[PDB]
Design a protein around this ligand. Structure first.
Ligand SMILES: CC(C)Oc1ccc2cccc(-n3cc(NC(N)=O)c(C(N)=O)n3)c2c1
Ligand SMILES: CC(C)Oc1ccc2cccc(-n3cc(NC(N)=O)c(C(N)=O)n3)c2c1
Length: 263
């Protein structure tokens, strides 16, 4: 079962304040050390989420952060995850900027691509893949997290393509125009994630408003090549950013292409 009783969790340390509430380091009885995220009432559709728990608990892969269960006896509810010692990838890149070998950056992209190839095979769409949603664990392994969560977020300004907070910087044209999500729209986001990795955590299109990103992308403009990305790596990024989803590679194809580049 995915229901975790309150008596089975102990909070040890406050890790920080997230988007939906607090994050603690804690222990899960007879199981493991965990990250526990407390979710503010009203931030998510909890009833919708728990309906998918029996199916979603079956997903398991070394490059996906495991969400073990939910503590829901009383509000605010808690989501219990595998603990990722080095935190989010975006902050990890920014704090260690100048210390990364190009091979390590390519390895980080390969970990994410492997996790995404598993989700693509499982027919699970991430919808908001970005360096901020990837986590860094033991021996600098990168794992994907928060896949599918935007289907439960209750803030319309974030989830609607016409919303003032829409994450347009990672959105393919069919997502920013029609919310047409697919594993091919996640491939576009993955190309932006590759750019974030090779730029050591720079913000994509930092000098543009949301409408300006939409105009730039629709007129064929793309993110410039980061200094650390080889021309072969940048070519792959551009394949992720093809206007037509049908022309983008599947994650299964990207994984083989990037591994050949690495090895
Ligand atoms: C909550 C964030 C803003 O603050 C921190 C501060 C320090 C951290 C140190 C280590 C790990 C962190 N950490 C741990 C996380 N989750 C899991 N599954 O372990 C996350 C996350 N962003 O989801 N960040 C940390 C997160
Ligand atoms: C207790 C969990 C399995 O319940 C759910 C319920 C609904 C979900 C809907 C979309 C995605 C889910 N989801 C998200 C997960 N992991 C992270 N790191 O976000 C997992 C997992 N199996 O690791 N499942 C869901 C997980």
């Amino acid at each position: 079962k995915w229901v975790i009783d309150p008596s089975e969790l102990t909070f040890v340390q406050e890790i920080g304040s997230g988007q939906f509430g607090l994050v603690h380091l804690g222990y899960w009885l007879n199981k493991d050390k965990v990250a526990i995220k407390t979710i503010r009432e009203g931030a998510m559709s909890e009833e919708d989420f728990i309906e998918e728990a029996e199916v979603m608990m079956k997903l398991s892969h070394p490059k996906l952060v495991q969400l073990y269960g939910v503590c829901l006896e009383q509000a605010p509810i808690c989501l219990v995850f595998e603990f990722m010692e080095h935190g989010c990838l975006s902050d990890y890149l920014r704090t260690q900027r100048g210390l990364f070998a190009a091979e390590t950056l390519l390895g980080m992209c390969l970990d994410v691509c492997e996790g995404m190839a598993y989700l693509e095979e499982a027919c699970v769409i991430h919808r908001d893949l970005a360096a901020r949603n990837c986590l860094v664990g033991e021996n600098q392994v990168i794992k994907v997290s928060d896949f599918g969560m935007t289907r439960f977020v209750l803030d319309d300004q974030y989830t609607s393509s016409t919303g003032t907070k829409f994450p347009v910087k990672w959105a393919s044209p069919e997502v920013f125009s029609f919310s047409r999500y697919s594993s091919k729209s996640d491939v576009w986001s993955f190309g932006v994630l590759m750019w974030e990795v090779f730029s050591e955590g720079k913000i994509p299109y930092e000098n543009r408003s949301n409408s300006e990103v939409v105009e730039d992308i629709s007129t064929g403009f793309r993110l410039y090549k980061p200094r650390l990305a080889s021309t072969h790596v940048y070519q792959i990024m551009n394949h992720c950013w093809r206007e037509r989803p049908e022309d983008r590679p599947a994650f299964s194809r990207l994984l083989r292409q990037l591994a050949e580049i690495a090895e």
